[PDB]
Design a protein around this ligand. Structure first.
Ligand code: HEM
Ligand code: HEM
Ligand SMILES: Cc1cc(N)nc(COc2cc(CCN3CC(F)C3)cc(F)c2F)c1
Ligand SMILES: Cc1cc(N)nc(COc2cc(CCN3CC(F)C3)cc(F)c2F)c1
Ligand SMILES: C[C@H](O)[C@H](O)[C@H]1CNc2nc(N)[nH]c(=O)c2N1
Ligand SMILES: C[C@H](O)[C@H](O)[C@H]1CNc2nc(N)[nH]c(=O)c2N1
Ligand SMILES: [Ca+2]
Ligand SMILES: [Cl-]
Ligand SMILES: [Cl-]
Ligand SMILES: [Gd]
Ligand SMILES: [Gd]
Ligand SMILES: [Zn+2]
Lengths: 402, 400
């Protein structure tokens, strides 16, 4: 039998048949589980390519057609003579959508079919590259009505270096390593901040300075491009009832755009392929503003709320953190920037799981990452047993280029 | 072979060298991770291994008292088919089985645990007497103390001592003719058993169930608990005066009565254990889970929150005040209670000690991180390795 999974809220029990098709292997063994750890050539090429082509031809219900036979023989031959192959434009669209769908740690996959694929595979420099990214940012932001998107730059090929985006996200706030060891700004970004300065960017001093982009064309040092201020939509944070909250001077950007993962499709690998959607409020509120190693505003909010911060059995931390999440959602709703709260996010996810069971008989999900970072057992995915495993196509972490 | 484990808030790295000695096999493979799932003569070799453990524990291994005990158990099994634990070994295996429990966040307490030897027990009324001493001793007027009572081990050819109740204190769950349930829905199966085995049903949301105790090769027997023995806490809020009127209450003693204990290849199908509650077990899981008392929307109504839009975070605002009411009510009543913040920071200190005592600590992240305010507690940011050491507590098939 396959793994029996159970919902503890309804009582229902499914079986994950899909997990059996897992090709690449993960970090657990029968002797110890490592599911909480953040970071765990022609014939392999041909078998990876073959499986993808079959997936494409399954999707459009043309399995076994003449075109399916022919595209396999086609791909077999280009690999035999070039050692590589090229994806058709429609295969590349299907692949990116499958990579999102396959991402165990994404709670937003109900959207996986509504994804706008920008082909940039004939990009030829860091300048053309920056251009493709401003077009992405412009399209996905859409003056606050967010639309998911991905720009696919050229594939890894033997002989040439990769395109790389050095920033982890397109929009990120500077993190200034202050002289006494602290940080003014986002501490997650002190490394990329240091690298930007060294490469010629003149920094500022705010807690919310937008970083410039370091873009790396093949075999070439990274280049510095500044984003146009009017392309970076930002939301000033205020509270529906706590009027002093606005004086804190808090801002966050509209667009979450992950720029440093690698997209892998039918064995081909795309080092640079920024994708974006919209935020879940708890990523801004709890994670980005309350993590102790992030902006870490939680105690200061609480004191202004006049909460007894001297004993945890008042649950001041939880009262303050709830209020920072109210402010985030209310400020996005105000500025008319798309955003979703962790209750709708996770209940749409439960709608994704049920479809995936019908569609594929399984859905790779990382429980520790799908459960939101506040109010876990309040949401429905808490009581949902989940099976984690690796499908291709896929987004993958990759080394920092430097 | 030595799993690197990181703390992301701090940036500290340690390696778990203890996972190499993992006795049994978990549910996971290189192909698929199943951590999230809730339920995932060679006797001589388990018993040999536990004894080296024990004598190493007390700084006198391979020595004189070691080899005596070895050829002791050997002859015991060769003459019987099982063997008998020394009292001190029983005490030590009791604490180890708690200390090895990967899902327990309270393991900072594993040193202080009162073991009650009841392996000289026969008859359900004898069971019932051992049990009420436990309850009395562990309640201790509200200053809770940790304890386990060990009933006679499994042995070949013979029946078994089973407590049919999942916990020693459990509220009744009456399936209604409208479909739903009055009381604790978790307990619909045990409550029907109590009626089927003689008990006269109450009809309240907090009717304490009787005890169905089973002695080898006889049916189980009803055993009602003296009401002065089951310390309960009426729930009220420090500032919301209506809250008291909701009539909520919970019990003082978390006491688990359905797990099996395993020591040196020996298995004890009855061995109940008890400590004190973490607040989020009461406030968030038992009162707020959709399939338990499910009180969130009622508390929210009373606070005049907006319940037709998820983004007002009414579920969160309600849950917090419910948890605040739990903490206030236990403190007011001088019953031991611990909040998830204090608990989780103590569990860090347990991880950090155990890193020096044994070089690691089996921990199940999904069950260590509390069900409210996850990322606000420091265990959220701690990578964890889950494996199975022995001795241990285990789940076991229901007796019927
Ligand atoms: C449209 C709305 C979307 C929402 C609400 C959403 C939500 C989320 C959240 C909350 C996470 C966990 C993030 C963290 O805490 O680090 C995540 C992870 C992830 N998302 Fe989504 N996402 C969306 C769109 C997308 C798109 C469009 C893609 C790719 C085309 C994508 C791919 C991924 C991947 C690969 C991860 C895993 C990264 C990691 O392990 O940190 N997501 N998503
Ligand atoms: C004294 C303070 C204690 C605290 C604060 C505490 C807290 C907790 C919590 C919150 C859990 C997770 C709830 C769950 O399992 O769903 C748990 C599980 C557990 N604890 Fe503790 N506990 C304490 C004492 C004990 C004692 C005295 C023992 C045994 C002698 C023990 C052994 C276990 C076991 C075996 C489990 C879960 C088994 C499983 O689900 O696989 N704990 N505890
Ligand atoms: C498209 C999209 C929409 C949305 N709402 N959120 C995301 C965040 O995804 C990622 C988020 C992070 C940040 C790392 N994490 C640890 C910290 F706590 C956040 C890395 C990464 F590699 C991701 F992919 C993406
Ligand atoms: C001694 C002690 C103290 C304390 N504070 N909590 C406990 C929890 O005991 C257990 C509780 C449960 C219940 C299952 N889960 C669903 C609900 F969410 C808890 C299972 C289990 F296997 C346990 F072991 C024990
Ligand atoms: C150590 C731990 O696994 C790590 O902090 C994880 C836990 N789960 C998470 N889940 C999400 N969605 N995002 C995260 O950053 C994390 N962090
Ligand atoms: C499906 C999932 O494994 C299940 O809800 C788990 C999650 N974490 C938990 N954590 C604790 N402490 N108790 C639980 O019952 C659970 N349940
Ligand atoms: Ca061609
Ligand atoms: Cl982010
Ligand atoms: Cl409980
Ligand atoms: Gd106000
Ligand atoms: Gd009122
Ligand atoms: Zn695992």
């Amino acid at each position: 039998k396959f793994p029996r999974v159970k919902n503890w809220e309804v009582g229902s029990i499914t079986y994950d048949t899909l997990s059996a098709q897992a090709q690449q292997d993960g970090p657990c063994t029968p002797r110890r589980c490592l599911g909480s750890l953040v970071f765990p050539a022609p014939e392999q090429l041909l078998s990876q390519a073959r499986d993808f082509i079959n997936q494409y031809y399954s999707s459009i219900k043309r399995s076994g057609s003449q075109a399916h036979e022919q595209r396999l023989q086609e791909v077999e031959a280009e690999v035999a003579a070039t050692g590589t192959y090229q994806l058709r434009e429609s295969e590349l669209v299907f692949g990116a959508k499958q990579a999102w769908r396959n991402a165990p740690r994404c709670v937003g996959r109900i959207q996986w079919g509504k994804l706008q694929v920008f082909d940039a595979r004939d990009c030829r420099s860091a300048q053309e590259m920056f251009t493709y990214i401003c077009n992405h940012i412009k399209y996905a932001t859409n003056r606050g009505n967010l639309r998911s998107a991905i720009t696919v730059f050229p594939q890894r090929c033997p002989g040439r270096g990769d395109f790389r985006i050095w920033n982890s996200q397109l929009v990120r706030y500077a993190g200034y390593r202050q002289q006494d060891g602290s940080v003014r700004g986002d501490p997650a970004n002190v490394e990329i901040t240091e690298l930007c300065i060294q490469h010629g960017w003149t920094p500022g001093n705010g807690r919310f300075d937008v970083l410039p982009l370091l873009l790396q064309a093949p075999d070439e040092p990274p280049e510095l491009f500044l984003l146009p201020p009017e392309l970076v939509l930002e939301v000033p944070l205020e509270h529906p009832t706590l009027e002093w909250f606005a004086a804190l001077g808090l801002r966050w950007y509209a667009l979450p755009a992950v720029s440093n993962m690698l997209l892998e499709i039918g064995g081909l690998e795309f080092p640079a392929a920024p994708f974006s959607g919209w935020y879940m409020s708890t990523e801004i509120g709890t994670r980005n503003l309350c993590d102790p190693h992030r902006y870490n505003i939680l105690e200061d909010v609480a004191v202004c709320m006049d909460l007894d911060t001297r004993t945890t059995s008042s649950l001041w931390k939880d009262k303050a953190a709830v209020e920072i999440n109210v402010a985030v959602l209310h400020s996005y709703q105000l500025a008319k920037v798309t955003i979703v709260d962790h209750h709708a996010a996770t209940a749409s996810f439960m709608k994704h799981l049920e479809n995936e069971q019908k569609a594929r008989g399984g859905c790779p999900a990382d429980w520790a990452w799908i459960v939101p970072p506040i109010s876990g057992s309040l949401t429905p995915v808490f009581h949902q047993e989940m099976v984690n495993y690796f499908l291709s196509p896929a987004f993958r972490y990759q080394p920092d280029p430097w």
